[PDB]
Design an enzyme around this catalytic site. Structure first.
Site, PDB file in Angstrom:
ATOM      1  N   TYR A   1      -1.508  11.339   3.098  1.00 10.40           N
ATOM      2  CA  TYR A   1      -2.328  11.719   1.947  1.00 10.40           C
ATOM      3  C   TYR A   1      -2.252  13.212   1.641  1.00 10.40           C
ATOM      4  CZ  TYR A   1      -4.820   7.187   2.073  1.00 10.40           C
ATOM      5  OH  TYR A   1      -5.148   5.854   2.044  1.00 10.40           O
TER       6      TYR A   1
ATOM      7  N   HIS B   1      -7.319  -6.390  -1.100  1.00  9.52           N
ATOM      8  CA  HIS B   1      -6.341  -5.337  -0.877  1.00  9.52           C
ATOM      9  C   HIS B   1      -5.453  -5.586   0.336  1.00  9.52           C
ATOM     10  CE1 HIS B   1      -4.707  -1.274  -0.183  1.00  9.52           C
ATOM     11  NE2 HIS B   1      -5.050  -1.486   1.075  1.00  9.52           N
TER      12      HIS B   1
ATOM     13  N   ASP C   1       0.827  -1.200   0.000  1.00 10.59           N
ATOM     14  CA  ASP C   1       0.000   0.000   0.000  1.00 10.59           C
ATOM     15  C   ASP C   1       0.867   1.259   0.000  1.00 10.59           C
ATOM     16  OD1 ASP C   1      -1.916   2.035   1.922  1.00 10.59           O
ATOM     17  OD2 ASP C   1      -2.873   0.962   0.253  1.00 10.59           O
TER      18      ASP C   1
END
Ligand SMILES: O=C(NCCC(c1ccccc1)c1ccccc1)c1cccnc1
Ligand SMILES: O=C(NCCC(c1ccccc1)c1ccccc1)c1cccnc1
EC number: 3.3.2.10
Lengths: 545, 545
Positions: free
Chosen positions: B463, B521, B332
């Site tokens: 982010y 995921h 990730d």
């Protein structure tokens, strides 16, 4: 005041640049052919892009070859069959090693207040053998406040922009910093900016100028102590080995695992001079806080400190870490522990080494009290038996306690014979102990803060399992130590005396030996340089095998 | 209820004892000659002393040879030239490997409440090649409540005393425990004591009896998940990389260093199924708490989480640990981080591997916002931009947050498109989320307690550096990744979709690949077995080289 060093040709020799000369003379190629294709294109040239971080070294390798072809074509010559540019650069980079005297200079300068930094034109190395370069950089890196690399900052050292960057990083005026470089072109801008410069041809002359302009003795200066450990710069490990017993250790380096076991009353910090050295020599050092000390748990019960549980816990320590094996190096009580690791868990010990502490097999006949009473120097061990007494005077004044203990062969202050009945360990000892030459006030304050956590109960409990340890040891009386083993004696250790080890051969036939002149009982900090030389040499031959 | 297993012939095959048969048949020596000199003297015999811990294996080697001479002398034969007893035992011990099906049985039994233990007659191994035996024992050891070794307890397993010891250790009545052994003689005493016994000839029949008497399915049972990690049984490391930024990691095993970098919003614990596997495969695993998570520091400032400072700190992490290099495996966001490690610090990366996360080069033309807006699945990333908003709903109910997120390909509950404007991440999500089949309630509560320390600010800040990361990445647009590199795609990852990696070859020419069927995921816990197979295989060929 600050000091700035180039890498290639200044902190590292032989200058890699000087391979584009050797190579020519070796292949009898036209003078300069190489160093020309190397700089072909100037700023727009491949090498400049390589040095700015636009491309990687492996990307650059092909670009340099085309230039060498196009450079020999104009010169009207042609390179041989397997002319390998990669081959040339590989052995060049690999041949380049640290300039020890120049590093010393940097060290001293920093030790005396200078902000130090390395400013170098360099590349992003993606070669298969890139690790060699990374190893050197790591070793050098640690010794400087800053490391500025061209390929990282996107600037290149001829350019004036990188010089302004340097000063900005340094927080210093040009007039305030010295700048050493082997290339004169890369000197101008620093000079023009007003800062001191030194063209580095031969190292000693440059150091003459350096010492000259700094007012600091740098050349012909005494042999320095090995690199030490700043506690807060260390990787700290924590393993629970039992419901409420946790072990702390410091960890450094890669390679075969080396477990260092300090003595009484010390800590992992007692290996400060060997941790970096052994890591540097290609080993993974695990320096323990032994049970009862520092950040390791310190349960009050006496039996928690008999050799059987101490050793079993060490075994569990390897288990939790996923280590089938480790080389065990002990000093003092740690040395004792290490011999029992060897006798009771050979599968777990890659190799054993003791400092000062001989291997004496238990006497099945005499009680461990008769035997210990039978030695005048061990009088203080009867003093340690009664719980609370020794704790009290040892915990009364921590700084005093250590300043008194941690002393060289000469500067002793403790009456170690006739201790208990004549009062205590510090009967006629100054309550204002001088500072030993072995230790700075700072290092003493470290032990002081460490022992403020649990005190001396745990440590002293190591002394209170004589009958238990004796019974346990008697089981191994039929055994021999046949794994790699090394005993190191210290001349001036007046309780753990060299002569005590004289019979060890009987029990450890292939026992290797070491000895240290004018070394007291605190071997690690007394003679760190020689200690490191002895262990590193023994590890290379007996541990790595 | 408890279960006890012998080692040789039960948990390990082929039984070393069965080499004194092979050797005879191979050298055409009289039947039994070996197995006789081996047991010569019975209790007083060398082997019994060897097994009681009176002597070491190397001490025993000579004793066994004399017996073989004196045993062949009475039988009126003579052994060949270089008849090496050490040679025979070396390859015998080395040939002996774990009985996987028998270990499974033990595992299941323990998983369902049984106290398990290994009781074996064994020796103190001081052979030069003793590490092989120690490695096996460590691997087996971890799976049992107790390991009782004859040479450690001074008792030997025929003797009834060791059986009483076993039960005392187990805290169980004879009638309450099963006891498996390949040697019948060593069965009697347990039987006589009243406990269940099983002569182990063939493994499957013994498991039939075992399953038979335990009432537990042991044979033909499904393929089990890889070994996991009990947090409090782990070695925990702590490194300060900056004035007030400290990184935490878990460490296991020896060999080349492997740094595992989890994603959002996870922790070191997300590698629980690979940490033991990779250590077992001969590697030194460092599983990180990435900056902002768990026991790592979590500074509030957004720029503390741009890739440039994150990578620089990772570099410092190696520095403090004395590591010139490490293989970096990321998932990730960690995978993103890992690609930048490769692009910006090739010297430091032995090899790079990413799970799910492709390497996408920055677009010099489009803003990182246009580009991210241009993908519907990345709608929640605009939601993450405004500080506080996402923190609030993610921190509102921790158990819910993770139970919702950590779900398999099928059992999804989150509307991941049209998130911010339609409310939040959990718009039409149950406030009472089911428990995924990937995770137990316990594992969820671990993440819950971890995130109670710093919350989501730090994690979400990963982010919030898009424009910073974009600018930084643009510097590497001329570079290629030419170190060993492996990309692993997960079929059912509906945001980090396999197709996104389709162009990576252009930037990473020698890129190796892996792919996982029906994997979502959360790759590590979704398909741990296949993940381990893929990484271990890639490490062996590209990392160790
Ligand atoms: O007592 C042991 N070591 C302490 C040695 C140390 C010392 C510390 C405090 C009080 C008294 C002595 C010492 C300080 C100065 C000079 C020589 C020794 C010992 C016992 C058994 C096995 N291995 C080590
Ligand atoms: O957003 C990233 N990963 C999060 C992926 C994860 C998720 C967690 C919480 C909210 C939203 C998504 C997820 C959960 C379920 C299924 C697929 C993905 C990302 C961004 C750039 C680079 N690498 C990774």
């Amino acid at each position: 005041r600050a000091a700035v060093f180039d890498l290639d040709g200044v902190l590292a020799l032989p200058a890699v640049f000087g391979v584009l000369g050797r190579t020519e003379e070796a292949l009898a190629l036209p003078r300069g052919l190489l160093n020309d294709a190397f700089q072909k294109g100037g700023p727009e040239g491949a090498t400049t892009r390589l040095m700015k971080g636009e491309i990687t070294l492996s990307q650059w390798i092909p670009l340099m070859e085309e230039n060498c072809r196009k450079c020999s074509e104009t010169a009207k010559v042609c390179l041989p069959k397997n002319f390998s540019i990669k081959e040339i650069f590989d052995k060049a980079i690999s041949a380049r090693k640290i300039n020890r005297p120049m590093l010393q200079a940097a060290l001293m300068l920093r030790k005396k207040g200078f902000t130090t930094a390395i400013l170098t034109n360099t590349w992003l190395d993606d070669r298969a053998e890139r690790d060699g370069l990374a190893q050197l950089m790591c070793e050098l890196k640690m010794h400087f406040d800053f490391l500025i690399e061209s390929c990282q900052v996107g600037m290149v050292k001829p350019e004036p922009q990188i010089y302004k960057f340097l000063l900005d990083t340094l927080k210093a005026s040009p007039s305030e910093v010295v700048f050493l470089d082997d290339i004169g072109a890369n000197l101008k801008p620093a000079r023009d900016l007003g800062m001191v410069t030194i063209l580095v041809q031969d190292t000693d002359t440059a150091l003459k100028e350096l010492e000259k302009v700094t007012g600091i003795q740098l050349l012909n200066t005494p042999a320095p102590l090995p690199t030490s450990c700043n506690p807060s710069d260390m990787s700290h490990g924590y393993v629970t080995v039992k419901p409420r017993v946790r072990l702390h250790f410091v960890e450094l380096g890669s390679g075969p695992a080396v477990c260092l076991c300090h003595g009484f009353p010390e800590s992992w910090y007692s290996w400060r001079y060997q941790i970096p050295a052994l890591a540097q020599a290609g080993y993974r050092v695990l320096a323990m806080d032994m049970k009862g000390y520092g950040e390791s748990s310190a349960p009050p019960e006496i039996e928690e400190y008999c050799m059987e549980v101490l050793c079993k816990e060490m075994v569990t320590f390897l288990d939790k870490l996923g280590l089938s094996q480790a080389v065990f190096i002990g000093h003092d009580w740690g040395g004792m522990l290490v011999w029992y690791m060897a006798l009771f868990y050979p599968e777990r010990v890659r190799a054993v080494a003791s400092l000062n502490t001989p291997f004496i097999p238990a006497n099945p006949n005499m009680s461990p009290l008769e035997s210990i009473k039978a030695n005048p120097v061990f009088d203080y061990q009867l003093y340690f038996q009664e719980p609370g007494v020794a704790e009290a005077e040892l915990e009364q004044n921590l700084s005093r306690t250590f300043k008194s203990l941690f002393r060289a062969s000469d500067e002793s202050v403790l009456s170690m014979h006739k201790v208990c009945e004549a009062g205590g360990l510090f009967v006629n000892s100054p309550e204002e102990p001088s500072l030993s030459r072995m230790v700075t006030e700072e290092e003493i304050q470290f032990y002081v803060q460490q022992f403020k956590k649990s005190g001396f109960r745990g440590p002293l409990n190591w002394y209170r399992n004589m009958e238990r340890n004796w019974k346990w040891a008697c089981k191994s009386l039929g055994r021999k130590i046949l794994i790699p083993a090394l005993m190191v004696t210290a001349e001036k250790d007046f309780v753990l005396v060299p002569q005590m080890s004289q019979h060890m051969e009987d029990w450890i036939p292939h026992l290797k030996r070491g000895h240290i002149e004018d070394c007291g009982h605190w071997t690690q900090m007394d003679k760190p340089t020689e200690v490191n030389q002895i262990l590193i040499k023994w590890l290379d031959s007996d541990a790595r095998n």
